[PDB]
Design a protein around this ligand. Structure first.
Ligand SMILES: [Zn+2]
Length: 544
């Protein structure tokens, strides 16, 4: 009965989707699919973050328009996400008419309300190319150790940190020309004006404890005005009444999520939902799934921007940690920097979805993809615990009972134990305690396989006159499978479809209350195959 708008952070246009992105999008998709299973109105929204100096320069180097480049990158991203069955209701772009109009609108309102300030700043400028240079586009000699060709505000040889203005014999990364300091008028958003409001939100208890603690650190350091303008040349939205000035990509980026929803409503011919979800008096819920590196933008700048422009603010922020492979940050040299597209050439989407889900919690701690454990866990849990319940029992039903399940449950008590667990498992999905949900589900799977072993169908099947017993035992196992697959439906989309085809029924959350009796099931190839380390080794080699 709830109206929920859920978003995932917008992937940067100039970068292929990797395992890190997948952790975020999979976490959100699992939650979204569960919400849909409970009958709520859900709108899963995302978009490609396509503006900025890096993108502008990349396009120039490739000899194509930025529009063409971001378009191709967007399609690549969507192909990968579709491959992992991320169920977005809309995937738009921050470079859109919807975002242009909403960004101009919000800026206008913020300015009218007195939250925009003008101040001149001094910044390194490339006089040859004719453009201001972001820190990483300035290279030179470290002022401390004198090591050459160091980029931005830090030296990769001695570890020193400094302003790029301290680099010796500075050079433009773009043209090689010597940059010089140049003045420029910039527009600033008065974030400090929203300090009390933001502090109240931080202590409200809605945000994750770890996030609230980090925010207190930021309040202690002190909030500062935010530089939201960038000079031409730039690829983005030009600021109204300010020729040659553009909105910094980070200002328009989150607005792009609002833009993606407007685009969805407009395509649907829905003239009421946008305001119903974004107006101050909205009763709809708004959630953002994000990573630790952008919490400052989404927890401070964003809510303040919305408040200052008369829009509702996030109901909550769901933050996840970094992804590690084999315990460490992804390493290109070790072949652990894995792209989503590469992953799919070696394994299916469900395997990664399951593994991440089994490790995820409501905290922001890092998630580790240990490849050896990946093979062991997928084979042990999916193939040997869950799918086993169907694969060990379906054959007998199809070959000896014409594919028809027993007329009654052989062990009603055991079945109730399984259906009684729906409350706790659903609450775990709801609270984002994915690890807890999976542990509860696998505990049930253990009891199910214990039941089959206690009945020993491989023994019953060879004994004279025990046909009824065999059908009863195998049908019972298949019904336990039905329940487990329902609980795992948000996690394993493809296996679920194969399971529903086998069971001749769509799996619904409430449906488990009525077991399948005197019901016809269909035969199947292999619901899920084992994986091995040879495949992992191939994945790693292909990623080097
Ligand atoms: Zn140095």
């Amino acid at each position: 009965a709830k109206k929920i708008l859920v978003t995932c952070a917008s992937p940067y246009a100039n970068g292929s989707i990797h395992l890190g992105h997948m952790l975020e999008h999979i976490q959100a998709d699992v939650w979204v699919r569960y919400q849909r299973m409970r009958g709520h109105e859900v709108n899963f929204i995302c978009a490609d973050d396509a503006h900025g100096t890096p993108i502008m320069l990349k396009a120039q180097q490739l000899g194509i328009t930025p529009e063409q480049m971001i378009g191709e990158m967007s399609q690549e991203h969507q192909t990968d996400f579709a491959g992992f069955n991320i169920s977005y209701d809309n995937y738009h772009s921050t470079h859109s008419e919807e975002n242009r109009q909403l960004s101009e609108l919000i800026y206008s309102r913020l300015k009218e309300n007195g939250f925009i300030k003008n101040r001149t700043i001094s910044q390194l400028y490339d006089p040859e190319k004719g453009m201001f240079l972001p820190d990483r586009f300035v290279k030179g000699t470290c002022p401390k150790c004198k090591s050459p060709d160091q980029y931005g505000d830090n030296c990769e040889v001695c570890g020193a940190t400094y302003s790029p203005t301290e680099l010796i014999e500075p050079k433009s990364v773009v043209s090689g020309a010597t940059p010089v300091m140049r003045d420029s008028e910039h527009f600033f958003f008065d974030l400090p004006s929203f300090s009390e409001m933001l502090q109240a939100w931080t202590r409200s208890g809605a945000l994750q404890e770890q996030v609230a603690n980090k925010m207190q650190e930021w309040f202690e350091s002190g909030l500062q005005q935010w530089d939201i303008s960038r000079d031409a040349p730039y690829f983005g939205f030009e600021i109204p009444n300010a020729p040659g000035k553009y909105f910094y990509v980070w200002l328009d980026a989150p607005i792009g999520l609002m833009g993606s929803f407007k685009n969805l409503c407009d395509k649907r011919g829905d003239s009421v939902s946008f305001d119903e979800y974004w107006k101050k008096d909205s009763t709809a819920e708004l959630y953002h799934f994000i990573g630790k590196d952008i919490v400052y933008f989404l927890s401070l700048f964003w809510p303040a921007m919305l408040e200052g422009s008369n829009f509702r603010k996030p109901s909550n922020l769901f933050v996840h940690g970094y992804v590690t492979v084999n315990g460490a940050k992804m390493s290109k040299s070790r072949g652990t920097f894995i792209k989503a597209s590469t992953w799919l050439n070696h394994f299916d989407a469900d395997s990664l979805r399951y593994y991440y889900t089994a490790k995820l919690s409501s905290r922001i701690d890092d998630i580790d993809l240990n490849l050896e454990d990946f093979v062991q866990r997928v084979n042990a849990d999916i193939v040997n615990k869950v799918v086993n319940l169907a694969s060990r029992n379906a054959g007998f039903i199809n070959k000896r009972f014409d594919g028809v399940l027993a007329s009654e449950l052989a062990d009603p008590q055991l079945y109730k134990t399984f259906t009684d667990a729906a409350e706790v498992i659903g609450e775990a999905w709801e609270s984002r305690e994915f690890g807890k949900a999976v542990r509860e589900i696998m505990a049930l799977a253990d009891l199910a396989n214990r039941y089959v072993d206690e009945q020993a169908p491989w023994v019953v099947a060879k004994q004279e006159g025990r046909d009824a017993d065999l059908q009863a035992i195998c049908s019972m196992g298949i019904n336990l499978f039905r329940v487990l697959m329902t609980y795992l439906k948000p996690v394993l989309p493809k296996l679920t479809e194969r399971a529903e085809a086998f069971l001749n029924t769509e799996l619904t959350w409430d449906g488990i209350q009525q077991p399948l009796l005197g019901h016809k099931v269909n035969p199947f190839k292999a619901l899920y195959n084992r994986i091995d380390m040879r495949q992992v080794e191939a994945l790693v080699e292909a990623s080097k």
